[PDB]
Design a protein around this ligand. Structure first.
Ligand SMILES: *[C@@H]1O[C@H](CO)[C@@H](O)[C@H](O)[C@H]1NC(C)=O
Ligand SMILES: *[C@@H]1O[C@H](CO)[C@@H](O)[C@H](O)[C@H]1NC(C)=O
Ligand SMILES: *[C@@H]1O[C@H](CO)[C@@H](O)[C@H](O)[C@H]1NC(C)=O
Ligand SMILES: *[C@@H]1O[C@H](CO)[C@@H](O)[C@H](O)[C@H]1NC(C)=O
Ligand SMILES: CP(=O)(O)Oc1ccc([N+](=O)[O-])cc1
Ligand SMILES: CP(=O)(O)Oc1ccc([N+](=O)[O-])cc1
Ligand SMILES: CP(=O)(O)Oc1ccc([N+](=O)[O-])cc1
Ligand SMILES: CP(=O)(O)Oc1ccc([N+](=O)[O-])cc1
Ligand SMILES: O=[P-]([O-])[O-]
Ligand SMILES: O=[P-]([O-])[O-]
Ligand SMILES: [Ca+2]
Ligand SMILES: [Ca+2]
Ligand SMILES: [Mg+2]
Ligand SMILES: [Mg+2]
Ligand SMILES: [Zn+2]
Ligand SMILES: [Zn+2]
Ligand SMILES: [Zn+2]
Ligand SMILES: [Zn+2]
Lengths: 481, 481
């Protein structure tokens, strides 16, 4: 569909003149950031952003690509180079080290320099690199970790953990040799490494001993406690902190977030990862947006400011399944959380960065008409005279041969939330991709986010802006009101 | 391979501190641009840039992803939204209208607002939108169009032409009805619409009458003149201009570029598109880099400045063939031309933008090791126990079934310049992709290139910077020395 207003060159000339005017009004702050927020869209590469934009645009009453995402409104954009030291196409652990600790690492480690080696506990010590969240806490700020994955998953773990193996969620996962050598599971590190004021996401099961019924799924043993060391890490965490509260459902989260006596909040809402937003039980579980508001309610109380990590963690998971519907709906909720945080904080004193840890082999092609569904079929048949979708993957579990040939696809099929887009190469899981991802920035010192940068720049600019870390002797004035 | 220097966090901390220092030194110009250059990598989306970076890095003596491209050095980056008014995944014609004329258009038209309709000559008039190159000429600047495609191809044609059908290269292509209605073929528009000081690229055949032997391929009739109207457009062009010269090979180009008497230069180096750089005869044909230097030699003579369009036009073609080797080697030469232009001009008075018209369904995945060839195999077998490549396409002519199954692939195979990477969906040509592309900018007013912008912003910022177009009453001081 051709929107009639766009047929007039005046439309485009007016928009561009407005854009130039806005561009000219941008000015760098001379003041520090009081608060720091990093919004991390796990797997949310450039093709994901554009596809999500079109979907969100249409979710409103619009054609799609012309409607800005909340992240699109951020004034400063850079490209981020995501390679890990040892692999061109990275994982979430070692990218987390980059954008949260300011140092690149090796694939599948977390919070360690690249002198460490994956799954070799005895290469850990001396290679720990401290996150800017840790440094923010050291400087008296409150700190929060919010995600739709397990809070022990690779991305959030980058804010607090140091491990040669991202798979070490609980003691049950850690080999005897590594346990003897003192490599602590990530769940233990979560409560032990540093004080964290707000922890919200999944990962209940790793906190409790084997035999402990999950409170939400008391009749499903696979959802129960995993620990072999008899520890209740939740009780241990509560015991270290006056004003600490543990919650496992949305109603208790709400109560806690408005309770002036709380000060420390741990909310673990599923045994493992949280459900996809399209499957979320809105009585029992908070959305990503709701969890970020809850975090902001508590974190904002500290007059020294806060550091907040917010992850759209299952964008990645959708793409791994080659179910773009799941990837893109997770991305929209992520963008909704960004928008919400923007309403609850000031860009006068809050530096917000939105970025991705890496991308996926997700593409948006064919020659679809303006206004057509992102989950639809490309116009015109493929060379094999069967239909194909505008969304495709390079590799992954959507590769199919039915009776020795690529299957035809219908619109009803392609639009289903369970539909897996086709790929070139069958894999149980679609693969991350190695191309640069965007960094979007707003707030004090956001203008420093520019050009093409190593992914480590994200951590460094955040530390600099708040005069943390290796950067007091930041030559900045106190945060603006 | 893990580079040992990168195992030390100091390495990353030093790099980031240097990056922050550089970021802080950036300051906006208060002065106008004397000169304008747009470097257009046709099809050069974010995945192309990163893959090309790795390849170029290795072409040097390096591991790949850590070595900046020339374009990576540009201080200002934005994301560009490429949708055409009528299609989410655009073509080169209507994107050209956006980034060269500042107005979005309909798929496969050039230099027309979206009130026009593809292949409907009688919707042309009133819908012409004037390029910033045209406006630069009007303001007394010299202007040049340089590309590896036919100079009548969609991208260069955006600088000078207005047509409802990008396929109308010569009169032979234009239907009788459209000819009667006065829709001129693009070759005619090239010599007739505006004065162009330098025209370099392919497209000889459209300038000469049927029967005219090509000077370079006088024994291949398919390469000869195409025109049915008896016109010699080269002789016509020469006849309008004292100091005009026509060349068709590299040696004559060189001679012309150093000849003070020349002033107007048309160099048409192949009948159609120029050969891929890997197939270029370096005695007979100039590289893109050589053509941009030749253009700069002449254009720089004008004290009022110049506008220059430089296109890496066959990046796109490589991807369409699903031959990433061709796409990425074209991208490197494009980056080499950018680098060269940077050596021959000053960022004190020259605004240079590098961008792409749109992307491709090209992905870079698997989990390859640091330092491995971009054309290599992903580590580990696919689910069908056969190998697969790190580079893949969503769709295109690399889809194969040999004996009813996806074929295995070897490193020798995958590294060949003729190898077509596999896709999910067989098409004669791989498809463009609709995700945002980068804009890189340096020079006066380059700081205005920021955030996420409509593709039209590229034209507008260029006009603004040089105080052209709807922008005198730019509030800018004269160009710096
Ligand atoms: C780590 O332990 C393994 C297994 O005993 C041994 O081969 C290796 O030398 C150790 N590395 C270090 C750094 O001690
Ligand atoms: C939420 O958790 C509390 C225990 O902290 C429990 O009393 C309440 O029943 C829970 N809500 C639901 C719906 O299970
Ligand atoms: C263009 O010509 C076609 C064919 O005669 C006709 O159907 C159409 O109405 C014309 N459109 C305009 C704008 O005159
Ligand atoms: C280049 O073109 C000129 C004619 O302008 C011709 O004299 C010369 O032979 C050409 N060079 C080659 C190698 O064909
Ligand atoms: C499929 P396989 O188990 O072999 O390998 C991988 C394990 C983890 C990973 N990551 O993104 O952390 C990528 C590949
Ligand atoms: C989605 P909506 O913002 O409307 O509602 C909620 C917001 C915050 C919250 N909390 O526990 O902080 C719970 C629900
Ligand atoms: C394959 P078919 O000829 O049908 O269509 C197309 C023609 C041109 C084009 N373009 O990128 O300008 C895209 C598709
Ligand atoms: C590739 P290299 O730059 O070395 O050589 C040339 C540079 C310019 C030129 N000209 O005709 O303007 C011809 C060749
Ligand atoms: O490796 P990551 O996407 O959890
Ligand atoms: O449509 P274009 O890539 O020539
Ligand atoms: Ca729950
Ligand atoms: Ca030639
Ligand atoms: Mg994650
Ligand atoms: Mg082109
Ligand atoms: Zn990830
Ligand atoms: Zn992943
Ligand atoms: Zn193109
Ligand atoms: Zn193309």
């Amino acid at each position: 569909i051709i929107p009639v207003e766009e047929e007039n060159p005046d439309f485009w000339n007016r928009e561009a003149a407005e854009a130039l005017g806005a561009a000219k009004k941008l000015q760098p702050a001379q003041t520090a950031a009081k608060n720091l927020i990093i919004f991390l869209g796990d797997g949310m590469g450039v093709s994901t952003v554009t596809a999500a934009r079109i979907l969100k645009g249409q979710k409103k009453d619009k054609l799609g690509p012309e409607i800005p995402l909340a992240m699109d409104r951020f004034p400063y954009v850079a490209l981020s180079k995501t390679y890990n030291v040892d692999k061109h196409v990275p994982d979430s652990g070692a990218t987390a080290t980059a954008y949260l600790c300011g140092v690149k690492g090796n694939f599948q480690t977390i919070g360690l320099s690249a002198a460490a080696r994956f799954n070799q506990c005895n290469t850990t010590r001396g290679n720990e690199v401290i996150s800017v969240m840790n440094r923010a806490k050291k400087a008296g700020k409150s700190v929060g970790v919010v995600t739709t994955t397990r809070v022990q998953h690779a991305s959030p773990a980058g804010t607090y953990a140091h491990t040669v193996n991202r798979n070490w969620y609980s003691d049950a996962d850690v080999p005897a040799s590594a346990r003897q050598e003192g490599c602590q599971d990530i769940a233990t590190q979560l409560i032990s490494n540093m004080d964290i004021d707000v922890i919200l996401g999944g990962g209940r099961k790793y906190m409790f001993r084997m035999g402990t019924p999950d409170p939400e799924y008391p009749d499903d043993y696979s959802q129960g406690g995993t620990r072999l060391d008899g520890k209740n890490l939740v009780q241990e965490w509560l015991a270290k902190r006056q004003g600490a509260r543990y919650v496992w459902n949305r109603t208790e989260l709400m109560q806690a977030s408005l309770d002036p006596s709380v000060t420390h909040l741990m909310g673990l809402f599923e045994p493992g990862d949280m459900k996809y937003e399209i499957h979320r039980d809105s009585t029992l579980d908070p959305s990503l947006m709701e969890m970020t508001e809850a975090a902001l309610r508590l974190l904002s109380r500290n007059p020294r400011g806060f550091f907040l990590f917010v992850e759209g963690g299952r964008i990645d998971h959708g793409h791994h399944e080659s179910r773009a519907y799941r990837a893109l709906t997770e991305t929209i909720m992520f963008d909704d959380a960004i928008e919400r945080a923007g309403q609850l904080t000031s860009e006068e004193d809050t530096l917000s960065l939105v970025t991705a840890d890496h991308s996926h082999v997700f593409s948006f092609g064919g020659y679809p008409l303006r206004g057509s569904s992102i989950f639809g079929l490309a116009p015109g048949k493929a060379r094999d005279r069967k239909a194909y979708t505008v969304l495709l993957y390079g590799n992954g579990p959507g590769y199919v041969l039915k009776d020795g040939a690529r299957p035809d696809v219908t619109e009803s099929e392609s639009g289903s939330p369970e539909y897996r887009q086709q790929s070139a190469v069958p894999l149980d899981e679609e693969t991350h991709a190695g191309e640069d991802v965007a960094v979007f920035a707003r707030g004090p010192q956001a203008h420093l986010v520019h050009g093409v940068q190593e992914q480590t720049f994200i951590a460094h600019v955040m530390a600099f802006a708040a005069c943390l870390e290796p950067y007091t002797a930041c030559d900045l004035a106190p945060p603006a009101g």
